[PDB]
Amino acid sequence: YQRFEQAAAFGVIASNANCVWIPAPGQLITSALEDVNIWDIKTGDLVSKLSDGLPPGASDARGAKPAECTYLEAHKDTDLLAVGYADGVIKVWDLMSKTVLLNFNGHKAAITLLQFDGTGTRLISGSKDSNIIVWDLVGEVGLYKLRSHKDSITGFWCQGEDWLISTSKDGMIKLWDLKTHQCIETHIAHTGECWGLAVKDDLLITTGTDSQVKIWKLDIENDKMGGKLTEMGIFEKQSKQRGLKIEFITNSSDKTSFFYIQNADKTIETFRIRKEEEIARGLKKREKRLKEKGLTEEEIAKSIKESYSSFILHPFQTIRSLYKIKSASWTTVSSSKLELVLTTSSNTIEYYSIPYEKRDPTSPAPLKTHTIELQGQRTDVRSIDISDDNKLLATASNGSLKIWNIKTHKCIRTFECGYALTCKFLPGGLLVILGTRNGELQLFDLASSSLLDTIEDAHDAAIWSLDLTSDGKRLVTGSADKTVKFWDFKVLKLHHDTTLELTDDILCVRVSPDDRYLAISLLDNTVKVFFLDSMKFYLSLYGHKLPVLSIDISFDSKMIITSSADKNIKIWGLDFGDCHKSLFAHQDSIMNVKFLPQSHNFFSCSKDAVVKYWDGEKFECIQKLYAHQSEVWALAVATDGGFVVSSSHDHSIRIWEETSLKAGERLMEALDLGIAEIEGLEAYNRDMKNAVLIAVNKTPEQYIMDTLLRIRMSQLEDALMVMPFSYVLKFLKFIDTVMQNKTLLHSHLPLICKNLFFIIKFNHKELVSQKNEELKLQINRVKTELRSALKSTEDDLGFNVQGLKFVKQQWNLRHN
Amino acid sequence: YNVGKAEKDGEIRLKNGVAMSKEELTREDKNRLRRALKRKRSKA
Amino acid sequence: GHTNAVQRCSFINKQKQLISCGADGLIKIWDCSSGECLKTLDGHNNRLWALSTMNDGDMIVSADADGVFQFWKDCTEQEIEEEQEKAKLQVEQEQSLQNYMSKGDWTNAFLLAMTLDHPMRLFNVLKRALGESRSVIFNEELDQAISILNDEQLILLMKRCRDWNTNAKTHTIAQRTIRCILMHHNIAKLSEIPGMVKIVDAIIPYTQRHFTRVDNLVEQSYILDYALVEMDK
């Protein structure tokens, strides 16, 4: 067999990620599923597209869906782009070279936020796994992990090396000490989640789930053990939905500050930071108004605290868009006007300009200056088709019908229509016919670029299916009104010919290539085959647990495939209607199945985002194609069979083209290292008057001590017997050095006693024979501190047992 | 007297004599304790 | 769910809930959407014929057949605030506790661990506070902290000291803390605390076992003395 590989992917302008604006209105960097698009806002054309490589369908290609981009961060000075993916992988991209420089893998979940430091040598990443990791770009390593948060990292602020403020979906705000790698402060930002965080000097603003927005002052140098973050006031934004992102921009000329609160709904609410003189002017005025009202000074002071937020903040303007907003970013700040750029969940980029003078804007609503919409569709494509010449691809979606050039991938024409469900080219490639959900049939002409005819009363319900005979003169349309209607093309207008009334709703109607059979899928889990010439009932196919969603008939009119919502593909013979094989193809409903022309091999797409290549004779899956991120709604096969086009819920149109040591010995080694260091320091100090230990970061006494602890007690006594006498003198020296460290002595006092006494007992004879005066002093010393440490513990034990006994006596006396 | 189960519902007390409040335990400590309990009940 | 006849039924919280009274004297607040009894108010000992609501059920009055009125006031908003303030305080104490341990402020970290009831942290605070004293019982500040403990904190602390004592690897920390308590408290007061005696019942037998040990270790330590005299020969 031949392999199918992703030749091209297009139709996506902005996926589920943020947008990065770069000055030249300048260019915009947006995510396109696994790839990153760079757009030019003025022209609306795609400048460059970043793709790592490994096209889907290749043998080297991975066997799962590629990870989508989730966050985009670009360091303007260094011309680097950091891209975070849904699997927790960070890829640093050389924007000039359009290639991957570094690859970081430290997160177990999707990356929620990336941030270059000011100097551009260190990169901070937050992910849905609740960890913040600070990377070293020059070193290509993860410096450390910050692991206090118990949920996804929504936002964080780090403008200095010393401190970091982080927000998470668990509703906590945490101040980090980057030099100690610890959390110093923790406050509950909001009663539920906490979603937004923007910091400007001491001012700090956070947004929760509701309309409440809190204000805090950031006094980093307070150093009281608390109060580095103190809540000031609460102000309610108009939008009741959660606030996702907050961003500050300052006007250099006037030092004025503005920010927005991007809402989960179709609104961006902008605000202004009042200058200090305005606040003082307002404070004096409001005091006069309240004083004139007769309020007491204490009440006036309390009122000012209640209305504290209003003094700093002024609601500036609200931006309303036709579609839900996915991300927004400040572009340019100037005295004349204020500009914003945003991306919607409906696959478009919008540019907004706000002209203003002094406190308030000049115009009631913002000015939409630019939009990038031509190269995409707002709603998901429900049906696609390929012209007989294999050059034009028509993609019908809810509200628009767009037509593309398979070679250039550029949309040629756009037509406004209803909720289109099925589309098919007429022969010659010059006309298109749609079946809308309202029961309307719409016919379009490409050269005229306009609609020729509309039949409003074509069907009483949704036209779920629509097919054409090989001659191209007859049209068969199935609808949820339980009827099949035959139409003729006469010079161009459509005339109703006949009606076939069936017992249940109709989901698919297919005409055999030889025009002899007509297969109809019904909502009662059956497929009915008719003789097209006579409309005489021929066969009924039974065996699907759930309704059949697609039908296709082999080129020689011998086999018919049926795919259903029960996840099974059934291959039938038209001679008698017997089921040759039922294949458990996909893990979800199978939406479309098509035969490859002049062959019995067929393709299948399903809601599980997989396109599979099958052998119609061996009933085996040839190739699994993992490229789509969501449901694949429509599929189309070229007349030649050269390529297969699939469109998915993710707004992407993809073209597939045919191509050890034992105890005692470890102790002996530990003694050699530790006592070599101890002796070396002792000799060095006397004159004045290693790699392993440095790596473990332990003093020589502790290194030996840990080795003793790990030795299992059942092995400990026998391990010490193996030690030579030369190592026993080493052992005694080690005990001598431990005696000086009282903290280490009492921590492991019983263990040292058991070991020391066993060594002396086992080889007492050789110890006494030695005439070393230095050894005598060590034993004299080791005796004294050993007794005192033991007696101290015994003194506490003896004191308590008598005292606790006395307590019993008094309770007994008073209660008996 | 013998050390038994933790009297409070939010604490784990082992027969070793060490008590562990669920609040103070890290997520990593809690996971291994849960898996350790899973082994204990399995053989039981 | 009513044990007897339901005499009154009125909607509260707009469509969300329904409140009903019955001859069983019980007022049940139901959820209309799910049809489940969220709350049961029992302030009457007889049948309830009359039930009036004001401000969408923010105020509810029910009259018993005996002649008793119950003026119910909604307090869901009040109760959640108490929980939020309690939760806010707990988060502060946790963070302050961690900071004190890292800084080594054992005297302050001891108090927080007692209030929050964190045994592992309490053990580490006492264990490492003891280690510094090796280099009256613990410290001048920390002994004072133990002294000011009230009866409830003492009983909790002695329960930990009881459990730590059973293990020979951790009894040392238990003995000194007990020694500090005896040395900085009125022994008469300690006896009167209910349950203190039963806790002291468990400590004494284990203390005697630890005393029999260690004392033997003192005997074994004289092998060094016998080594020295042999070397002197």
Side-chain angles (χ1 to χ4, degrees):
Chain A
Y1 306 114
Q2 307 218 242
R3 274 201 91 99
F4 278 84
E5 294 191 344
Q6 180 175 306
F10 57 94
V12 185
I13 293 162
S15 71
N16 304 335
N18 71 331
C19 57
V20 179
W21 173 86
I22 57 174
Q27 295 178 354
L28 194 75
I29 307 186
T30 59
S31 61
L33 306 184
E34 64 270 18
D35 301 315
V36 182
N37 299 170
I38 310 188
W39 295 95
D40 171 25
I41 297 163
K42 186 183 287 186
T43 53
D45 56 351
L46 202 163
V47 177
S48 57
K49 184 176 172 70
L50 303 178
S51 66
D52 187 314
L54 264 181
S59 44
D60 296 333
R62 44 181 280 131
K65 61 163 63 142
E68 60 170 5
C69 171
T70 54
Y71 202 92
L72 297 165
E73 186 66 9
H75 189 223
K76 298 175 183 173
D77 294 345
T78 54
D79 192 20
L80 286 176
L81 177 73
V83 184
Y85 292 85
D87 55 3
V89 176
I90 298 165
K91 273 178 197 81
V92 176
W93 277 81
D94 189 312
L95 212 55
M96 183 278 288
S97 179
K98 285 151 220 165
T99 185
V100 173
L101 294 179
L102 306 177
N103 186 273
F104 300 119
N105 205 348
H107 285 298
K108 274 153 161 73
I111 292 151
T112 53
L113 171 58
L114 286 166
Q115 193 141 307
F116 284 102
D117 57 356
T119 187
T121 63
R122 294 179 66 188
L123 178 65
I124 308 93
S125 68
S127 163
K128 288 190 187 165
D129 57 5
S130 85
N131 285 303
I132 304 164
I133 299 166
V134 184
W135 305 92
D136 181 15
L137 301 176
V138 181
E140 291 88 7
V141 294
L143 296 175
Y144 40 90
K145 186 184 285 186
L146 311 180
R147 186 150 171 73
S148 192
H149 279 300
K150 304 295 181 182
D151 213 325
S152 309
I153 302 307
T154 48
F156 64 75
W157 165 86
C158 173
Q159 285 299 336
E161 190 277 331
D162 293 328
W163 303 93
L164 155 69
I165 302 171
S166 61
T167 301
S168 59
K169 198 173 167 212
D170 56 13
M172 311 275 178
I173 187 169
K174 293 194 183 210
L175 177 68
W176 297 89
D177 173 22
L178 277 296
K179 303 164 82 213
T180 312
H181 307 163
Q182 293 278 287
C183 178
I184 302 300
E185 295 203 354
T186 306
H187 305 279
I188 295 172
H190 298 269
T191 61
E193 295 83 349
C194 193
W195 283 101
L197 167 68
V199 176
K200 182 45 163 215
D201 308 299
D202 58 357
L203 170 63
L204 184 144
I205 297 169
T206 60
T207 48
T209 42
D210 62 358
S211 47
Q212 295 185 359
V213 185
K214 290 199 176 193
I215 315 178
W216 315 66
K217 65 172 78 72
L218 174 63
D219 186 1
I220 278 174
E221 293 83 3
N222 190 357
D223 195 58
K224 174 272 161 193
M225 212 285 298
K228 296 182 175 68
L229 295 169
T230 52
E231 187 175 10
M232 294 298 290
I234 301 166
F235 75 86
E236 311 299 324
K237 65 183 181 178
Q238 180 198 70
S239 179
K240 188 173 180 177
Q241 297 279 262
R242 61 183 187 164
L244 287 162
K245 187 172 179 197
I246 310 174
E247 199 180 310
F248 286 107
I249 190 160
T250 50
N251 191 349
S252 70
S253 66
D254 293 334
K255 280 73 176 175
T256 43
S257 306
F258 301 97
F259 69 94
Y260 57 78
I261 294 171
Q262 181 201 328
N263 293 311
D265 55 26
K266 315 177 179 187
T267 62
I268 288 164
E269 293 180 42
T270 58
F271 294 88
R272 180 181 166 238
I273 304 295
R274 291 203 180 106
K275 292 185 201 215
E276 198 282 299
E277 60 89 20
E278 295 199 330
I279 295 162
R281 161 187 169 207
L283 277 165
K284 206 186 55 57
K285 279 185 179 184
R286 194 158 220 189
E287 192 194 341
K288 177 47 51 195
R289 300 181 262 152
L290 293 166
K291 279 182 166 174
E292 282 166 0
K293 284 181 176 185
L295 277 77
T296 54
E297 294 196 334
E298 296 183 4
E299 285 170 332
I300 290 160
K302 197 175 178 187
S303 82
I304 293 164
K305 292 139 55 185
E306 290 152 20
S307 69
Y308 154 86
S309 81
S310 78
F311 277 99
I312 310 166
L313 275 191
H314 167 220
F316 185 76
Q317 192 169 1
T318 310
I319 308 177
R320 181 64 59 93
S321 177
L322 308 98
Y323 320 108
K324 168 171 169 167
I325 298 166
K326 184 61 64 63
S327 71
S329 161
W330 284 128
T331 76
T332 63
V333 65
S334 65
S335 50
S336 66
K337 73 203 164 309
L338 184 67
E339 274 171 0
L340 193 77
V341 70
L342 61 88
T343 56
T344 82
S345 54
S346 71
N347 197 24
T348 188
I349 293 149
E350 315 195 334
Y351 203 104
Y352 276 103
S353 189
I354 294 165
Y356 75 114
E357 275 307 332
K358 309 276 289 305
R359 285 216 310 110
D360 281 329
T362 61
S363 58
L367 274 178
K368 179 176 283 190
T369 57
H370 295 88
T371 46
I372 308 175
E373 288 178 353
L374 173 58
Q375 295 335 303
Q377 287 203 75
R378 305 292 81 77
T379 49
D380 51 39
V381 182
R382 294 298 184 174
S383 64
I384 60 170
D385 77 344
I386 298 161
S387 60
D388 56 358
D389 59 357
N390 304 332
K391 291 193 211 103
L392 300 176
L393 177 85
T395 56
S397 69
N398 175 18
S400 73
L401 162 64
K402 287 197 176 197
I403 293 169
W404 311 74
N405 190 330
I406 287 155
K407 293 183 182 294
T408 74
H409 318 302
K410 300 296 188 294
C411 179
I412 307 166
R413 292 178 178 82
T414 304
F415 310 99
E416 315 309 306
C417 58
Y419 202 118
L421 289 170
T422 61
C423 68
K424 205 174 316 306
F425 272 111
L426 291 183
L430 311 191
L431 303 173
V432 175
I433 52 177
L434 298 187
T436 68
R437 173 167 171 182
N438 322 295
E440 310 161 20
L441 282 164
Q442 312 205 22
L443 160 65
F444 303 73
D445 175 25
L446 311 185
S448 177
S449 289
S450 173
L451 188 150
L452 312 178
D453 184 14
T454 295
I455 300 92
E456 289 297 80
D457 300 66
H459 279 282
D460 294 331
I463 295 166
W464 282 119
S465 199
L466 181 150
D467 201 21
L468 287 156
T469 57
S470 79
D471 291 331
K473 326 275 179 71
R474 292 187 68 190
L475 186 77
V476 194
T477 55
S479 164
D481 57 11
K482 313 184 175 198
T483 69
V484 176
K485 292 186 185 175
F486 295 84
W487 314 75
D488 275 333
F489 281 119
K490 299 184 189 159
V491 181
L492 281 292
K493 59 181 74 172
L494 272 153
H495 308 277
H496 178 73
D497 297 327
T498 58
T499 307
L500 172 54
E501 185 180 3
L502 291 170
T503 69
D504 210 355
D505 295 334
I506 298 162
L507 303 175
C508 195
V509 302
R510 171 96 176 93
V511 177
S512 63
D514 280 34
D515 297 331
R516 191 197 330 259
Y517 310 92
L518 172 75
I520 301 163
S521 57
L522 286 159
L523 194 66
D524 60 6
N525 311 343
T526 72
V527 177
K528 294 192 178 156
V529 183
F530 290 84
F531 277 102
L532 195 73
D533 301 331
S534 59
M535 272 301 90
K536 286 193 290 181
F537 189 45
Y538 178 22
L539 291 170
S540 190
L541 310 176
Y542 298 89
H544 278 290
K545 290 174 172 191
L546 293 174
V548 176
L549 300 171
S550 181
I551 297 161
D552 197 69
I553 297 164
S554 65
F555 78 107
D556 57 343
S557 302
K558 312 286 269 204
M559 301 145 58
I560 178 167
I561 303 176
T562 55
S563 62
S564 161
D566 61 7
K567 313 171 184 199
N568 289 310
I569 302 177
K570 293 197 179 213
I571 300 164
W572 319 74
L574 290 169
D575 289 345
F576 293 97
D578 60 318
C579 186
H580 292 300
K581 182 72 181 292
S582 53
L583 294 166
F584 183 56
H586 290 267
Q587 300 300 338
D588 207 353
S589 311
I590 304 162
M591 301 286 328
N592 216 323
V593 167
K594 302 272 196 224
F595 270 114
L596 283 176
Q598 298 312 298
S599 81
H600 287 156
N601 298 342
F602 61 95
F603 277 86
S604 53
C605 60
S606 166
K607 288 189 180 181
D608 60 357
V610 185
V611 182
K612 288 189 179 189
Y613 185 33
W614 298 87
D615 191 337
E617 295 179 327
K618 294 192 200 122
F619 294 161
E620 184 178 1
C621 187
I622 299 160
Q623 195 181 354
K624 296 182 192 151
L625 307 169
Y626 295 90
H628 291 291
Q629 299 287 334
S630 298
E631 294 90 358
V632 186
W633 295 118
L635 186 70
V637 182
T639 304
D640 193 4
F643 60 90
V644 185
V645 182
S646 48
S647 64
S648 161
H649 188 75
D650 55 24
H651 307 291
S652 71
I653 301 159
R654 288 189 158 84
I655 302 185
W656 310 90
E657 183 173 1
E658 180 180 7
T659 65
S660 64
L661 282 72
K662 270 162 168 69
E665 293 179 353
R666 292 200 303 285
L667 180 62
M668 271 145 68
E669 293 302 80
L671 285 169
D672 283 339
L673 294 154
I675 290 156
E677 292 290 327
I678 289 161
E679 201 186 50
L681 270 283
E682 171 285 347
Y684 159 73
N685 283 328
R686 188 270 299 164
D687 286 327
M688 294 298 102
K689 299 292 290 299
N690 57 7
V692 177
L693 288 168
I694 295 161
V696 183
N697 199 12
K698 287 183 184 181
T699 181
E701 300 87 4
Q702 195 77 81
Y703 180 57
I704 308 184
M705 192 65 58
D706 291 331
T707 304
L708 294 174
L709 271 294
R710 304 341 300 181
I711 295 165
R712 274 286 269 273
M713 194 280 290
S714 57
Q715 302 175 344
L716 162 63
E717 74 296 330
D718 195 357
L720 300 172
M721 295 195 265
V722 176
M723 291 205 328
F725 185 49
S726 49
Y727 280 87
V728 167
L729 302 177
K730 274 176 180 175
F731 198 83
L732 294 174
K733 187 163 187 166
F734 155 67
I735 298 314
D736 185 5
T737 303
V738 166
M739 284 306 161
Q740 294 160 354
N741 196 341
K742 295 300 199 243
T743 314
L744 184 61
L745 171 47
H746 289 90
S747 293
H748 309 293
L749 183 66
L751 184 71
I752 299 294
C753 292
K754 284 202 51 83
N755 304 352
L756 178 64
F757 304 158
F758 182 78
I759 301 299
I760 301 293
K761 264 192 51 53
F762 188 67
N763 62 9
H764 180 63
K765 264 173 81 84
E766 202 167 8
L767 197 72
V768 298
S769 80
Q770 285 211 329
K771 302 201 159 190
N772 194 351
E773 294 293 328
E774 191 275 7
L775 175 53
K776 271 179 50 48
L777 291 168
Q778 285 182 349
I779 298 187
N780 209 7
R781 282 186 272 145
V782 164
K783 179 180 77 174
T784 55
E785 285 85 3
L786 183 63
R787 297 279 180 80
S788 297
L790 276 168
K791 293 288 181 66
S792 297
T793 60
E794 189 183 353
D795 272 28
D796 291 331
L797 279 159
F799 182 91
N800 293 339
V801 62
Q802 294 296 341
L804 296 167
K805 264 163 189 321
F806 184 10
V807 170
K808 298 298 293 296
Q809 169 190 327
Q810 296 298 122
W811 186 84
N812 281 358
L813 288 166
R814 284 181 321 121
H815 282 75
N816 284 0
Chain B
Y1 167 78
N2 191 357
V3 175
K5 305 283 190 122
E7 305 290 41
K8 291 175 69 176
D9 292 331
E11 306 205 348
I12 296 162
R13 181 160 64 157
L14 299 172
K15 294 182 151 183
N16 178 33
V18 300
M20 293 175 120
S21 288
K22 282 306 217 167
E23 295 178 344
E24 56 174 350
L25 296 196
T26 65
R27 284 169 281 181
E28 302 79 42
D29 291 331
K30 290 163 79 132
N31 298 328
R32 68 174 178 80
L33 287 166
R34 171 172 168 272
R35 297 184 271 214
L37 179 62
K38 254 161 66 193
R39 299 196 268 86
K40 291 180 182 179
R41 64 180 61 190
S42 83
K43 63 173 73 71
Chain C
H2 265 276
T3 53
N4 212 339
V6 187
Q7 294 184 1
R8 288 297 179 198
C9 59
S10 174
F11 289 90
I12 67 169
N13 192 2
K14 301 196 185 187
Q15 288 273 284
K16 312 279 189 166
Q17 315 183 303
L18 183 86
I19 188 166
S20 60
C21 295
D24 48 32
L26 298 172
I27 310 161
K28 293 188 174 293
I29 304 169
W30 314 79
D31 175 22
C32 294
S33 59
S34 76
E36 300 165 342
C37 188
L38 308 178
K39 178 64 185 174
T40 65
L41 311 171
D42 183 14
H44 297 288
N45 302 349
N46 209 358
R47 56 189 58 111
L48 281 53
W49 291 108
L51 167 77
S52 190
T53 65
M54 183 177 176
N55 289 322
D56 287 9
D58 285 349
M59 183 86 52
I60 309 169
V61 192
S62 45
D64 207 38
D66 275 327
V68 182
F69 298 90
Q70 283 282 358
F71 293 82
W72 312 96
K73 178 79 163 55
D74 191 17
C75 286
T76 54
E77 75 290 31
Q78 185 62 40
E79 290 291 327
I80 60 172
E81 285 156 56
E82 299 159 5
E83 294 266 290
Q84 289 176 359
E85 296 296 349
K86 185 174 77 70
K88 179 185 170 184
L89 173 55
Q90 207 72 343
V91 170
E92 183 179 1
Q93 285 166 357
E94 291 287 331
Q95 184 59 69
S96 62
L97 198 158
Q98 297 163 5
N99 301 355
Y100 284 143
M101 283 213 272
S102 64
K103 291 160 198 169
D105 182 4
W106 311 114
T107 178
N108 291 10
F110 166 77
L111 294 166
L112 285 173
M114 291 305 308
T115 59
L116 290 180
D117 195 1
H118 289 346
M120 261 285 318
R121 293 171 145 134
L122 176 68
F123 183 87
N124 291 355
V125 168
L126 300 173
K127 183 182 184 60
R128 313 184 34 71
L130 177 45
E132 323 295 344
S133 68
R134 303 302 194 184
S135 300
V136 175
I137 310 306
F138 276 106
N139 295 115
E140 67 275 15
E141 51 269 23
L142 193 145
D143 293 358
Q144 185 176 1
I146 294 172
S147 76
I148 54 177
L149 291 181
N150 66 46
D151 292 331
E152 301 315 339
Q153 308 194 69
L154 291 184
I155 289 286
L156 185 83
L157 185 64
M158 294 301 280
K159 282 185 189 293
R160 309 306 183 183
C161 297
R162 177 184 63 185
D163 295 352
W164 301 340
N165 197 14
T166 67
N167 185 6
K169 284 295 217 305
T170 65
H171 80 82
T172 297
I173 297 96
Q175 305 313 117
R176 264 202 182 298
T177 61
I178 295 162
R179 168 139 190 177
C180 189
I181 292 162
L182 300 186
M183 201 95 68
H184 293 66
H185 286 111
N186 188 359
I187 313 295
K189 106 182 179 176
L190 298 182
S191 70
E192 311 176 290
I193 307 175
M196 192 70 147
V197 178
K198 274 277 294 185
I199 298 156
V200 167
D201 276 330
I203 295 167
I204 292 162
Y206 287 102
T207 309
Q208 287 176 333
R209 178 193 300 195
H210 302 313
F211 182 77
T212 311
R213 205 185 64 250
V214 189
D215 188 6
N216 289 358
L217 276 295
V218 167
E219 289 179 354
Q220 287 171 243
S221 76
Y222 283 83
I223 189 65
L224 305 185
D225 267 320
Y226 178 72
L228 288 163
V229 68
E230 289 286 328
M231 288 182 158
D232 283 18
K233 296 174 182 174

